């Protein structure tokens, strides 16, 4: 069900306190231009204000739309620690101008990111060819399309981090590029309600 999808799942990669008052789930493609800009110019302030401070748990879920993006999503699984995983995705977003826009199968950018992160070639090769991880990524994506109605990215779901609650997914949904003030308004208001409920 859509509700069961909008909670922290066993295989989710988490950033911040698992018991934070607020939850943000983001679906995005690593090769999506607006996504990249959001991650470059808005997300760092969200992370500093809300994630580093323990106010909000952040769960990024892959939504790849092309060869580069799917391979990048697969490669992210070579990064186990929460900060390493986030930092890998951040690097891919940051380097969007550096893909090969003519040969869409050219993964030189990922080789560069792998080298900069001291990922060995054998580990790199295994990750970029891991059929089991590919399957998981594309199935998580199709599940989101079916149950959450995702067509365009990015999409954000922002809600109380309470596993017992029911809410219609569209009521907590935010789509596209949003400036910092949009998110601070949404998150501050929700956080206030959260603290009141948490006594």
From TrEMBL:
Disulfide bonds join 32-35, 78-127. This is Uncharacterized protein. It comes from Wolbachia pipientis wMel.
């Amino acid at each position: 069900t859509s509700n069961e999808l909008l909670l922290p799942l066993p295989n989710d990669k988490l950033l911040g306190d698992p018991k934070a008052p607020i939850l943000m789930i983001e679906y995005a493609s690593l090769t999506c231009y607006h996504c990249s800009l959001f991650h470059r110019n808005v997300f760092p302030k969200i992370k500093e204000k809300y994630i580093d401070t323990g106010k909000m748990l952040y769960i990024f879920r892959h939504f790849p739309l092309d060869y580069r993006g799917l391979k990048a999503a697969m490669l992210s699984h070579c990064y186990e620690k929460q900060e390493d995983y986030f930092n890998f995705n951040k690097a891919v977003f940051n380097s969007i101008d550096s893909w090969n826009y003519y040969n869409l199968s050219d993964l030189t950018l990922l080789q560069r990111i792998a080298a900069l992160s001291n990922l060995k070639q054998d580990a790199f090769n295994q990750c970029i060819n891991d059929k089991k991880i590919m399957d998981k990524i594309v199935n998580d994506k199709s599940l989101a399309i079916n149950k959450l109605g995702i067509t365009a990215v990015p999409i954000f779901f922002i809600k109380l981090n309470d596993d017992k609650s029911y809410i219609e997914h569209n009521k907590v949904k935010h789509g596209g590029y949003k400036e910092l003030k949009y998110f601070t308004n949404v998150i501050d208001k929700l956080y206030g309600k959260a603290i009141v409920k948490l006594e």
